[PDB]
RNA sequence: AGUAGUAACAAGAG
RNA sequence: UAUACCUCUGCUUC
């Protein structure tokens, strides 16, 4: 609900047509969230 | 120098100001105005610094002949800046500007280097010098005790160390003499002997001095070697359920067998 | 097949697996704004738990003060916050009779460290606040204010260097009838100039004398500032949290001192012992009560937690602690311990910005300030805001503070109180039933073990020790708190279950690039996972991962690539150059796009030290150049070890000061820094130890200087010009 | 101390110029004469 | 709008 | 009011 969706053309994905749509929105973010989203690879380190 | 020291004094003196300042500030509140500044406390330097590494001229240089080397930009790209710092009162420059002198900045002394960061050097022997055994699975009864973190030269209480190393590198300024003087009078001279044709700042002599005279004991989970030069290689020597045979270069002590 | 991350808890226990509980890849909460209602919350709040005790106008102040100690007990679960002195007094009798000694040797310790404790020592405070500019200040500032200050109005214990006069000028100054204090305010001044008109105007600050009524003084002498607590982890909605200002600093110092050179002493109390300590603490204090009781005995452990800990906590208890553990000790010491309490009894609250009303429709906002919170229709707040502000009315003052007689700040008597839920741990019993209890205390959090013949009498002594706590005004968190058969159990985020589990998860957030700079962020981040593998349990493939991680996060953070990478970048281009003209490419650090050479077994050592060989003469030349202009005037929470190299960088200062009414401060700083640069001049040990003296600071530099020119001439350094010369200047000095 | 003094040469006399023969490290604080005392041995 | 979540930003200041 | 499609600022607290 919070998506525009648009339908932009086509692939051939596995073989076969698939068609490709352009999700369009409005979002926003922050100097904190922009951070923490460059220290994302830990992700790894607590599951390893 | 003394000259210039009593020339600057005497310029300084003529603002009102620095005088006021310097007759009614005591020995001890310098303590105090020498801590006093704009600047705040960083609360999330882990941003801050991501933040400030994307801006234009996020480094402040000290107010110098060495400052004034580095050209204002190089093949395009902008070093530094002619805004001046607010804390240092020296020209603002991008990390570029680090680059580039490493890469074509003016090639100082480094004699004395490695006698003075002698503590740190000894590590890399006793690694470079080790020899490793096997490692082994299985259980380990890891037991928290307090151990020497890294092995010193002699190892003193704070005020002792610190009369040393006052001793060593500001004879002058020690004071009133204590015993420990007569007590290290060796390690002294020999000290004094190692560090004295180095250009490096005596601040820094202090610190790697306290590093090496001064004791780091931390508790930590220990099973089996508990000497210094195995505490320092910890990571590497157990697991909770692996063991790892570590053999440290160097020569060990008597007492430790 | 719809996977189900929780399954593994099937297989894996959940002390086994708690690390995958804690989210802490992800973001932790902010602040947004005013803290004013978290505040208000606070207030109304902390006397909620004690509006039936005593209410009474403080003459002094003039504020509405609430006293719950020896009040009415409670006939409900809410948080009481009527404690009984009593009780408290038989809790220390029990302590010290089982602790002899203590109580008198940590208050001469204390008293003995005291004397010794000079006024320098308040610059480490942090953030504090500053009466006379009614803001946040760093504390030496906050000091200095307050000593230029003092000085204006005949107090000069600074100038005798130690504490104690200092803190005598304190609770004098209390008794002045006008307090005066500067405040600065600009001047234009034509300067020369060659300017078609041949002037400038540049606005020259002067300082001004202002002066404050006692009974203001005093107020602002009292109060404490507030603000919301952000970043806070695994909670929901935030908090405030409050800052001192600079008076009861050196009398709380004293008494977290004996606090804790007490609780250094005690078994069962987990402060300030080190993480790594706590656990062999713990598992130690478990195993004494497992093998206790043999025959049916059911030893039974409690996950503790306290609710409105610092709200409920009064002063007027801390006092009669302080007065209690001082009983061996003179008068004077006992006159001084007693001072902080009796500051935090009358103390006063601040309450933020404030709140922000606004308008849609014209898109227009506006901050109303405490002082005016009032001047407005109530109904114009919102819902919530409305009923706050009616119950915050009683305990409001006109100049827009709210009085807090009860309750303590977020983090002040953190050991003073760790005493008193020892003091809780320490009578183990009541009426001679067969039970016994012992535990672990560490502020709001604690751990009590219980252990009895059938778990029905083990309820009971969790019962006991309850409504025992009451009467300490300690309440126990019913909802949070819970209790299970001794074997595994949780403390401070950190797991028990038969050993104490690793959670490396809490860490976690710690591995990133620190931000201090690109010579110590390394060191930091390799020493972060060398001790990361020895206390918190991580595998050598998980460090070796982490190493990899870190330079990830480095070399994107600090823009430095490997210089045969064709990454491109403002830096990265001289990189390439270094590259190129560096032979002993392996030499280089990664600051100079230079590879990682670091694995397990050399985290411990600098890269510097690493690649010192590796590295060609200029280049180590440039990088270790003496004089570099990169690095600044050193002075000698955790350490590292790292080289003092071109790496070694420091920012630029935060210049939003430039354009506001500040500015004076950089004028009033560099004026300092330039004595303190050439009194270190004239002093080369300044910088390291820390010079002593009551004399003038220009005398010891003339002095040093006459002696320096002296033995300078007389030695053969310089000529009869330059000693002439210098004597010359020195005798106008 | 106040009426001696050196001369240029190395010789003690009665007061012009600016080199007394006497060092005064009684009177001054302590922690300078102690730096007094100690740069001058 | 949206971010966001018990209150803020979606520029501020001279 | 004008300078001001200018200037300063990006944790700098009122």
């Given at each position: 609900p919070k998506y525009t969706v648009f339908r932009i053309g086509s692939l051939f994905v596995s073989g076969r047509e698939k068609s490709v749509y352009l999700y369009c929105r409005v979002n926003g973010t922050n100097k904190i969230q922009m951070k923490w989203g460059m220290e994302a690879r830990r992700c790894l380190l607590q599951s390893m | 120098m003394t000259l210039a020291?009593?020339?600057?004094?005497?310029?300084?003196?003529?603002?009102?100001?620095?005088?006021?300042?310097?007759?009614?500030?005591?020995?001890?509140?310098?303590?105090?105005?020498?801590?006093?500044?704009?600047?705040?406390?960083?609360?999330?330097?882990?941003?801050?610094?991501?933040?400030?590494?994307?801006?234009?001229?996020?480094?402040?240089?000290?107010?110098?002949?060495?400052?004034?080397?580095?050209?204002?930009?190089?093949?395009?790209?902008?070093?530094?800046?002619?805004?001046?710092?607010?804390?240092?009162?020296?020209?603002?420059?991008?990390?570029?500007?680090?680059?580039?002198?490493?890469?074509?900045?003016?090639?100082?002394?480094?004699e004395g280097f490695e006698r003075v960061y002698e503590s740190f050097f000894l590590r890399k022997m006793r690694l470079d010098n080790a020899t490793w055994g096997r490692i082994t699975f299985g259980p380990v009864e890891r037991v928290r005790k307090r151990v020497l973190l890294n092995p010193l030269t002699k190892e003193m209480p704070p005020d002792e160390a610190s009369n040393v190393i006052m001793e060593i590198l500001f004879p002058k300024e020690a004071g009133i003499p204590r015993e420990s003087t007569w007590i290290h009078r060796e390690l002294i001279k020999e000290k004094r002997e190692k560090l004295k044709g180095t250009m490096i700042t005596p601040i820094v002599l202090a610190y790697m001095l306290e590093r090496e005279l001064v004791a780091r004991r931390r508790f930590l989970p220990v099973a089996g070697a508990t000497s210094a030069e195995f505490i320092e290689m910890l990571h590497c020597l157990q697991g909770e359920?692996?063991?790892?045979?570590?053999?440290?270069?160097?020569?060990?002590?008597?007492?430790?067998? | 097949?719809?996977?189900?991350?929780?399954?593994?808890?099937?297989?894996?226990?959940?002390?086994?697996?708690?690390?995958?509980?804690?989210?802490?890849?992800?973001?932790?909460?902010?602040?947004?704004?005013?803290?004013?209602?978290?505040?208000?919350?606070?207030?109304?709040?902390?006397?909620?738990?004690s509006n039936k005790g005593k209410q009474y106008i403080s003459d002094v102040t003039g504020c509405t003060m609430v006293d719950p100690?020896?009040?009415?007990?409670?006939?409900?679960?809410?948080?009481?916050?009527?404690?009984?002195?009593?009780?408290?007094?038989?809790?220390?009798?029990?302590?010290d009779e089982e602790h002899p000694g203590l109580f008198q040797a940590a208050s001469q310790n204390a008293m003995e460290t005291l004397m010794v404790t000079t006024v320098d020592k308040l610059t480490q405070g942090r953030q504090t606040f500053d009466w006379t500019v009614c803001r946040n200040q760093p504390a030496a500032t906050a000091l200095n204010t307050t000593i230029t200050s003092f000085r204006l109005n005949d107090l000069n214990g600074a100038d005798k260097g130690g504490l104690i006069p200092f803190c005598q000028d304190i609770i004098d100054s209390l008794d002045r009838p006008e307090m005066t204090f500067f405040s600065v305010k600009n001047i234009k001044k034509k300067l020369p100039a060659k300017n078609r008109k041949g002037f400038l105007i540049k606005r020259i600050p002067m300082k001004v004398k202002d002066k404050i009524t006692k009974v203001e003084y005093i107020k602002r002498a009292l109060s404490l500032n507030t603000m919301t607590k952000d970043?806070?982890?695994?909670?929901?909605?935030?908090?405030?949290?409050?800052?001192?200002?600079?008076?009861?600093?050196?009398?709380?110092?004293?008494?977290?001192?004996?606090?804790?050179?007490?609780?250094?002493?005690?078994?069962?109390?987990?402060?300030?012992?080190?993480?790594?300590?706590?656990?062999?603490?713990?598992?130690?204090?478990?195993?004494?009560?497992?093998?206790?009781?043999?025959?049916?005995?059911?030893?039974?452990?409690?996950?503790?937690?306290?609710?409105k800990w610092n709200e409920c906590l009064n002063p007027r208890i801390f006092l009669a602690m302080t007065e209690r553990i001082t009983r061996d000790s003179p008068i004077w010491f006992r006159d001084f311990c007693s001072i902080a309490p009796v500051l935090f009894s009358n103390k006063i609250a601040r309450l933020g910005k404030g709140?922000?009303?606004?308008?849609?429709?014209?898109?227009?906002?506006?901050?109303?300030?405490?002082?005016?919170?009032?001047?407005?229709?109530?109904?114009?707040?919102?819902?919530?805001?409305?009923?706050?502000?009616?119950?915050?009315?009683?305990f409001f003052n006109e100049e827009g503070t709210a009085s807090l007689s009860p309750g303590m700040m977020m983090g002040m008597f953190n050991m003073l109180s760790t005493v008193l839920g020892v003091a809780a741990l320490g009578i183990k019993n009541i009426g001679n039933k067969e039970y016994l209890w012992d535990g672990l205390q560490s502020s709001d959090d604690f751990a009590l073990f219980v252990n009895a013949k059938d778990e029905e009498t083990c309820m009971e002594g969790i019962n006991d020790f309850y409504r025992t706590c009451k009467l300490?005004?300690?309440?126990?968190?019913?909802?949070?708190?819970?209790?299970?058969?001794?074997?595994?159990?949780?403390?401070?985020?950190?797991?028990?279950?038969?050993?104490?589990?690793?959670?490396?998860?809490?860490?976690?957030?710690?591995?990133?690039?620190a931000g201090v700079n690109e010579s110590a962020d390394m060191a930091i981040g390799m020493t972060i996972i060398k001790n990361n593998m020895i206390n918190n349990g991580m595998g050598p493939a998980t460090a070796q991962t982490a190493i990899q991680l870190f330079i990830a996060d480095y070399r994107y953070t600090y823009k430095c690539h490997r210089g045969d990478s064709k990454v491109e970048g403002k830096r990265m281009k001289i990189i390439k150059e270094l590259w190129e003209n560096t032979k002993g490419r392996d030499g280089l650090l990664v600051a100079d796009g230079g590879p990682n050479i670091y694995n397990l077994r050399?985290?411990?050592?600098?890269?510097?030290?690493?690649?010192?060989?590796?590295?060609?003469?200029?280049?180590?030349?440039?990088?270790?150049?003496?004089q570099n202009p990169f690095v600044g005037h050193l002075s000698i929470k955790m350490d590292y070890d790292a080289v003092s190299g071109t790496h070694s960088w420091r920012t630029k200062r935060n210049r939003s000061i430039l354009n506001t009414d500040q500015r004076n401060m950089i004028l009033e700083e560099q004026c300092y820094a330039k004595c303190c640069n050439l009194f270190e001049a004239c002093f080369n040990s300044a910088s390291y130890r820390k010079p002593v003296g009551q004399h003038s600071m220009l005398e010891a530099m003339a002095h040093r200087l006459r002696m320096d020119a002296r033995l300078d001439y007389e030695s053969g350094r310089m000529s009869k010009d330059d000693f002439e010369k210098a004597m010359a200047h020195l005798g106008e000095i | 101390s106040d009426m001696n003094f050196l001369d240029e040469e190395g010789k003690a006399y009665t007061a012009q110029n600016l080199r007394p023969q006497y060092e005064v490290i009684e009177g001054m604080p302590r922690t300078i004469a102690w730096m007094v005392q100690r740069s001058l041995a």
């Open positions: - | 020291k009593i020339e600057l004094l005497k310029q300084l003196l003529r603002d009102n100001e620095a005088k006021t300042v310097l007759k009614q500030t005591t020995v001890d509140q310098y303590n105090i105005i020498r801590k006093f500044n704009t600047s705040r406390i960083e609360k999330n330097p882990s941003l801050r610094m991501k933040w400030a590494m994307c801006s234009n001229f996020p480094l402040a240089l000290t107010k110098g002949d060495m400052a004034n080397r580095i050209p204002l930009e190089y093949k395009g790209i902008q070093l530094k800046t002619n805004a001046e710092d607010i804390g240092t009162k020296g020209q603002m420059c991008s990390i570029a500007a680090v680059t580039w002198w490493n890469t074509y900045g003016p090639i100082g002394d480094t359920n692996w063991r790892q045979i570590y053999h440290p270069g160097g020569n060990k002590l008597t007492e430790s067998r | 097949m719809n996977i189900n991350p929780y399954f593994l808890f099937i297989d894996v226990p959940i002390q086994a697996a708690i690390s995958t509980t804690f989210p802490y890849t992800g973001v932790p909460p902010y602040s947004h704004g005013t803290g004013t209602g978290y505040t208000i919350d606070t207030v109304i709040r902390t006397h909620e738990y100690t020896n009040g009415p007990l409670p006939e409900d679960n809410e948080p009481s916050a009527y404690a009984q002195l009593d009780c408290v007094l038989e809790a220390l009798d029990r302590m970043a806070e982890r695994g909670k929901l909605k935030r908090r405030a949290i409050a800052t001192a200002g600079i008076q009861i600093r050196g009398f709380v110092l004293v008494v977290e001192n004996l606090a804790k050179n007490i609780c250094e002493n005690l078994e069962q109390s987990g402060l300030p012992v080190g993480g790594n300590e706590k656990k062999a603490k713990l598992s130690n204090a478990v195993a004494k009560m497992l093998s206790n009781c043999p025959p049916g005995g059911i030893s039974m452990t409690v996950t503790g937690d306290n609710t709140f922000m009303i606004t308008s849609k429709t014209k898109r227009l906002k506006a901050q109303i300030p405490c002082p005016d919170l009032f001047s407005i229709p109530l109904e114009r707040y919102n819902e919530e805001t409305r009923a706050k502000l009616k119950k915050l009315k009683p300490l005004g300690i309440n126990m968190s019913k909802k949070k708190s819970y209790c299970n058969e001794t074997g595994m159990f949780e403390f401070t985020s950190m797991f028990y279950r038969d050993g104490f589990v690793s959670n490396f998860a809490m860490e976690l957030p710690s591995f990133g690039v050399n985290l411990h050592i600098p890269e510097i030290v690493l690649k010192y060989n590796l590295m060609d003469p200029e280049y180590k030349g440039r990088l270790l150049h003496p | -």
